[PDB]
């Protein structure tokens, strides 16, 4: 069943920047004491990022998955639960659903008839679904404040997710610093993805989520004795 949350405030994004955030491992090879130059799709340094709040105001708007998304979430109560990716977001096309319950994550690639306003509570997201090509069950991605960072990339029929989790202080703002995300999953989906919405639990407990867009750039990356990335330079 679907219901429309009447009584919210209009969605208005604030703005900040992603100072030296969102750098992921590009290879599965152990290098130490080396500096390498790499090409690819990266989140530009000091780039404009959008800010959304979930405090009687719920922000679940349709955004454009252009080339890859950097999604950061500051949360103490685990309000954010999952995402949906697709194009039409109707039953005329195939969509990807990633939802985290208390224990595990559930990934599904089917034809869903999403409701006009998706939110968890029950599971008031889709009226019905059919033709499920792919099903997955793993361990929860989301097992005072805690910063969770993800990178969603859609390449060559594979949905790739890189993640990192760090406990930060009560200053909900996106901390200024350096982060090095680590590979997490590769889902063989084989679909066309141009839009996505976020799934927010409503009881509303405070949470915040920031969105950034990947662009094609060259990066200089550094490796230490122990084999982990510790610094990077944006050449442009």
Ligand X SMILES: *[C@@H]1O[C@H](CO)[C@@H](O)[C@H](O)[C@H]1NC(C)=O
Ligand Y SMILES: *[C@@H]1O[C@H](CO)[C@@H](O[C@@H]2O[C@H](CO)[C@@H](O)[C@H](O)[C@H]2NC(C)=O)[C@H](O)[C@H]1NC(C)=O
The entry of another protein, ligand X, ligand Y, none that residue 113 binds, CB within 5 to 8 Å by partner kind: ligand X
Q: How far apart are CA 185 and CA 138, in angstroms?
A: 10
Write the DSSP symbol of residue 226: T
Q: How far apart are CA 112 and CA 90, in angstroms?
A: 6
Sheet of strand 215-223, all strands in order from the earlier edge strand to the far edge: 35-42, 215-223, 229-234
From residue 107 to residue 136, the character string flagging contacts with ligand Y as x (rule: CB under 6 A) and all else as - is -----------------------xx-----
Under 8 Å CB-to-CB from 143, ≥6 apart: which residues?
none
The entry of another protein, ligand Y, ligand X, none that residue 218 binds, CB within 5 to 8 Å by partner kind: none
- The residue from 131, 203, 225, 235 that contacts ligand X (CB under 6 A) is 225
The entry of ligand X, ligand Y, another protein, none that residue 135 binds, CB within 5 to 8 Å by partner kind: none
The entry of another protein, ligand Y, ligand X, none that residue 87 binds, CB within 5 to 8 Å by partner kind: ligand Y
- Note whether 155 binds ligand Y by CB under 6 A: no
Burial (0-12, 13-18, 19+ Cβ within 10 Å), 151: buried
From residue 131 to residue 170, the character string flagging contacts with ligand X as x (rule: CB under 6 A) and all else as - is ------x---------------------------------
- Note whether 87 binds ligand Y by CB under 6 A: yes
- What is the CA 22 to chain-centroid distance, rounded? 11
- Note whether 36 binds ligand X by CB under 6 A: no
Count of positions on this chain that bind another protein (CB under 8 A): 21
Q: How far is the CB of 156 from another protein (least distance, A)?
A: 6
Q: How far apart are CA 98 and CA 110, in angstroms?
A: 12
Site residues (CB under 8 A) for another protein, limited to 163-202:
182-183, 190-192
- CB–CB of 118/83 below 8 Å? no
Backbone φ and ψ for 90, nearest 5 degrees, come out as -125, -170
In the complex, the residues that contact ligand Y under the rule CB under 6 A are: 87, 130-131, 192, 194
């Amino acid at each position: 069943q679907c219901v429309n949350l009447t009584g919210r405030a209009a969605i208005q994004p604030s703005f900040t920047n992603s100072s030296q955030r969102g750098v992921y491992y590009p290879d599965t090879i152990f290098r130490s004491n080396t500096l390498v130059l790499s090409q690819g799709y990266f989140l530009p340094f000091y780039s404009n990022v959008s800010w959304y709040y979930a405090l009687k105001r719920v922000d679940n708007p349709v955004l454009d998955f252009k080339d890859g998304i950097y999604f950061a979430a500051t949360e103490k109560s685990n309000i954010v639960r999952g995402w949906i990716f697709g194009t039409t977001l109707d039953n005329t096309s195939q969509s990807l659903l990633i939802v985290n319950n208390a224990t595990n994550v559930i990934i599904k690639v089917c034809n869903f008839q999403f409701c006009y306003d998706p939110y968890l509570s029950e599971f008031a997201v889709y009226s019905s679904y059919a033709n499920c090509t792919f099903e997955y069950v793993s361990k929860s991605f989301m097992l005072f404040d805690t910063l969770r960072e993800f990178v969603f990339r859609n390449v060559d029929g594979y949905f790739k997710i890189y993640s990192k989790y760090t406990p930060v202080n009560v200053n909900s703002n996106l901390p200024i610093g350096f982060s090095a995300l680590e590979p997490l999953v590769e889902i063989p989906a084989g679909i066309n993805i141009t839009k996505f919405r976020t799934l927010l639990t409503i009881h509303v407990f405070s949470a915040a989520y920031y969105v950034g867009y990947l662009a094609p750039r060259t990066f200089m990356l550094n490796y230490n004795e122990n084999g982990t990335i510790t610094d990077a330079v944006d050449c442009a």
